[PDB]
């Protein structure tokens, strides 16, 4: 019956927790106590990207680690040459309510979406010299919080309908739908090898999904509130999460639990963005206190602070070569740090 | 200048993009944005009909003022994860049906939504143009059903004027930021045609107050 189904579910959860506790013999703090401290790292605003006239809600570095795309509520999608602060493109959005943007790894497409329940894909390197909508993928019944690119033909999107989906761009159809979240998915990070992705939702859980079979592998809990940011470790066997509880937590995949929690008593504000430096030693987290805090992954110590914004740091990305850190905030500015 | 020909041309293209962006930004600055957050589905369609997918954008002009309205009630998701996108909206148009005090109670759901919106941290300064729709149905229903079914405490009689005043006064007390924002109340109906002028007057008042706060007079 239903009661026995619930009893089986809770017994299985208890069994999972027992397995986690059995496998939890040592803490990452115990293992990483002997290693040398990260040191006081200080970064300066190398470039400031003006031009936006509203709150910047998302950004994404291109694979060239030079061109980046910024999304703002003014309805403008600007592609930035970070080396010279030159606008390369200014795509006029049909809907000004944009909450995600992604640069395709090839560099030919850029997709942005939001409250319109569509993250439309734009063809940049096209004839006619005008950025045009390649495909407007529709089928989500909620806001598109984050859509990222696997290839030039596949794009995975995270929506507020408690459902992420993989879309085939040419056919404009949902290849596989990912269900299982009980809350709105607000973040989504693809693995470096692009075979699986982890998505964080408001149910205070982060689920790993296999992009081929289409079923969840692992569910990770621990946060006390909604997760707004998620990022894969460069190795691929760990991922970090940021929630409104003012704590970043790093989860591992092969042991299926939490390694470190990155919290401080001074900070009480939520975390909107989380990204990992190259080599994964530095965990940059964008807080609501107008500060981009730089944690250390191996030790919960705070390496530094990027205090240069006047409003909430919505978006934050590290270059693929790991040379620059670009933080976007609701002050209509896109500062790049190094 | 240490810039090649192509770099200089790229700089020129960036400057042209900046100029076009500034032009569009000025156009959007002369744009009045309004949020249409009506409880349930009563009073939304009637208002959007009188004055002319996640978001249904409605654009209209009155006395050479360009109004943009957003119907976000169709989102069907967590409101706290996207209500900050509407921060800075000029005013919030709230529709409250007045025939649903008999149909918890629908007016109580409307009051709960009013608490959620009028006392939201993103809308501390954003004024509310509260529309109390369905006037004729209220007048026809009050002569047969008293207000006591919705509000247990009501010292007024069964006359329409007293009950309408009581509902308006209740919705006024629902907010705690008396100084920062002001709630504009209009008792409208399907037949009313001055709703556009009321929105224009309320929006002009809101803009005047915001400008005077910025200029430093207030």
């Amino acid at each position, epitope marked *: 019956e239903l009661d026995q189904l619930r009893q089986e579910a809770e017994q299985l959860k208890n069994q999972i927790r027992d397995a986690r506790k059995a496998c939890a013999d040592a803490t990452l703090s115990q293992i990483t106590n002997n290693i040398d401290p990260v040191g006081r790292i200080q970064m300066r605003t190398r470039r400031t990207l003006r031009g936006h006239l509203a709150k910047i809600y998302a950004m994404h570095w291109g694979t060239d680690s030079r*061109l980046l795309v910024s999304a703002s509520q003014d309805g403008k999608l600007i592609i930035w040459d970070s080396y010279t602060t030159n606008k*390369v*493109h200014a795509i006029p959005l049909r809907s000004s309510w944009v909450m995600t943007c992604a640069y395709a790894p090839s560099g030919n497409y850029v997709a942005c979406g939001g409250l319109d329940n569509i993250c439309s894909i734009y063809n940049l390197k096209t004839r*006619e*010299g*005008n950025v045009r909508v390649s495909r407007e993928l529709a089928g989500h019944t909620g806001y598109l919080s984050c859509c990222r690119f696997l290839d030039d033909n596949q794009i995975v999107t995270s929506s507020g309908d408690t459902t992420c989906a993989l879309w085939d761009i040419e056919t404009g159809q949902q290849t596989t739908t990912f269900t299982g979240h009980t809350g709105d998915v607000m973040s989504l990070s693809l693995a470096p090898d692009t075979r699986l992705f982890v998505s964080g939702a408001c149910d205070a859980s982060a689920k790993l999904w296999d992009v081929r079979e289409g079923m969840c592998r692992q569910t990770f809990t621990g946060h006390e509130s909604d997760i707004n940011a998620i990022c894969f470790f460069p190795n691929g066997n760990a991922f970090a999460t940021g929630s409104d509880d003012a704590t970043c937590r790093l989860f591992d995949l092969r042991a299926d639990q939490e390694l470190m929690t990155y919290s401080h008593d001074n900070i009480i504000c939520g975390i909107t963005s989380v990204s990992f430096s190259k080599s994964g030693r530095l965990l940059l987290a964008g807080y609501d206190d107008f500060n981009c805090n730089v944690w250390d992954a191996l030790k919960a110590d705070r390496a530094g602070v990027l205090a240069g914004h006047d409003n909430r740091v919505s978006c934050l990305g590290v270059t693929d070569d790991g040379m620059a850190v670009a933080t976007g905030s609701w002050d209509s500015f896109l500062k790049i740090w190094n | 200048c*240490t810039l090649s020909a*192509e770099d200089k041309a790229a700089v020129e*293209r960036s400057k*042209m993009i900046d100029r076009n962006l500034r032009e569009d930004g000025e156009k959007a600055a002369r744009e009045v944005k309004l949020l249409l957050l009506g409880a349930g589905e009563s009073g939304k369609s009637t208002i959007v009909k009188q004055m002319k997918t996640g978001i249904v954008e409605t654009h209209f002009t009155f006395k050479d003022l360009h109004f943009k309205m957003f119907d976000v009630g169709g989102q069907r998701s967590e409101r706290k994860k996207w209500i900050h996108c509407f921060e800075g909206v000029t005013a919030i148009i709230f529709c409250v049906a007045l025939s649903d005090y008999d149909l918890m109670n629908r007016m109580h759901e409307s009051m709960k939504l009013f608490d959620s919106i009028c006392n939201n941290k993103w809308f501390t300064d954003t004024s509310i143009i509260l529309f109390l729709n369905k006037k004729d149905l209220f007048e026809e229903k009050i002569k047969k059903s008293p207000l006591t079914i919705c509000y247990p405490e009501y010292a007024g009689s069964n006359t329409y004027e007293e009950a309408a005043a009581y509902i308006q006064c209740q919705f006024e007390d629902l907010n705690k930021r008396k100084d920062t924002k002001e709630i504009y109340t209009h008792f409208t109906c399907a037949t009313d045609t001055k709703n556009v002028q009321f929105v224009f007057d309320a929006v002009t008042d809101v803009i005047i107050k915001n400008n005077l706060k910025d200029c430093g007079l207030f």
Partner: single-chain antibody
Amino acid sequence: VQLVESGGGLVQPGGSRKLSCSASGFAFSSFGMHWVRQAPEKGLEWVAYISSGSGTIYYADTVKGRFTISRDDPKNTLFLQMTSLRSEDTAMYYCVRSIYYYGSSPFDFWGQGTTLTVSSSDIVMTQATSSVPVTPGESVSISCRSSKSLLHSNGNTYLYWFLQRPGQSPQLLIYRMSNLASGVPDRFSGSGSGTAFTLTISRLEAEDVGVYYCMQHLEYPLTFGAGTKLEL
């Protein structure tokens, strides 16, 4: 995308004539436009350039103060009004479009051209091989040499390669010394060192037969070179 051109014809010396280049199938407003001149038997020579928004207009020393180039973005048409024509001005004027941004492909499209026959401190580029015999299926290496190093401090070697098939407008092969232009087959390749540059064509076909030009874009008396004709 098509760039048709009008004007030309018999003009008495000292006269005036205006060439029109109608633009269609692309965003003419965003594209900086050029005018490249090809003498009846000689190579290509740059004449004028009007930027997007008509911001910066640059001229060749031969036509400076004698030619005026303007564009009508709403009408999508380029104008090259020229007064006091000399006999050196007889040539096939080409309408060349070029957008400039990071990773762009300048000089991507060349119009058919209009024949005008008048009645009777620059980076010189030298293509030593005026003509090279070729058998189909083999490999050849066209060499171009620049007087001044074309490698700027930005890290880009501004060298462009073009192909002009017999009786056809030039087409773009390689831009910035190693970047295959869109549509060009992967057999073409380009290499250089700052002053000396080469272009390689593996598995050459009948289509590849023509004349190859190298253009510099470092400064703006844009200088071409005498072509290298690849006959069978």
